Amino acid sequence: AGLPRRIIKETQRLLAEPVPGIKAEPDESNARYFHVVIAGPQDSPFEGGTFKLELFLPEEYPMAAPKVRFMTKIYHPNVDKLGRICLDILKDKWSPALQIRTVLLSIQALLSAPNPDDPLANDVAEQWKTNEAQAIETARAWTRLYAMN
């Protein structure tokens, strides 16, 4: 009557063996909805910050990709103004062989290595390409403003 074994499995392993630097907790009403916090990675301009993300497992998971979005404002060429994440495995390259944990790891890695070279990078990419020092400082400024509480 309930969730597929795979979802029970992934949920329970997430709470038993969390990814370092990532907290992931179930929603109180929806068993497919998770509230995630990702620590800014070591040596990134997001370091010291904590970033809220939400994750949803749609009906067709794992045939369908999990849905993920930042809910904390972040200055990054691959995360847009509404928190949407450009990550190939959330669209093009999703497959049932991948799992939730792979996604969270990929997102952490994206914060550690932003990609302003991506064709679909937002308008922040130009700044990252041409004045990387300033862009990194702006990312730190936004970490101070939005990601410290």
Next chain:
Amino acid sequence: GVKVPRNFRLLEELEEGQKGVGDGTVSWGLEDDEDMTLTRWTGMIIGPPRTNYENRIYSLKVECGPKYPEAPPSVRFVTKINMNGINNSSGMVDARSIPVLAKWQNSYSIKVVLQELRRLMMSKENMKLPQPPEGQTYNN
């Protein structure tokens, strides 16, 4: 019964709004493109032909609260309109007087609300109401 959480539903509605639907006589989008809460939307309704609303663009504010879409959004006209169910001094849409809101289902959406209001503009009780001057808006 798998419910899609509010924010992911609203992202779906954002994408549909950008793609547009039907003949484009209703449209919707975020009021502030930096609003991560996805709460405040702009609605547009083209007044339907052969009514006193015809050839007028109606702008609306649609607010999707914390319980959307289990609960209906709040809707107010910005453009002044005389129409049953719309407070004629403030533009507020009275949910109890508009069937899509009064009988809200979680399958409904901002699109559906705007389409319903446009359909109701063609109702016998509305289509001949004399209107305020074109382009006038409510305060606040």
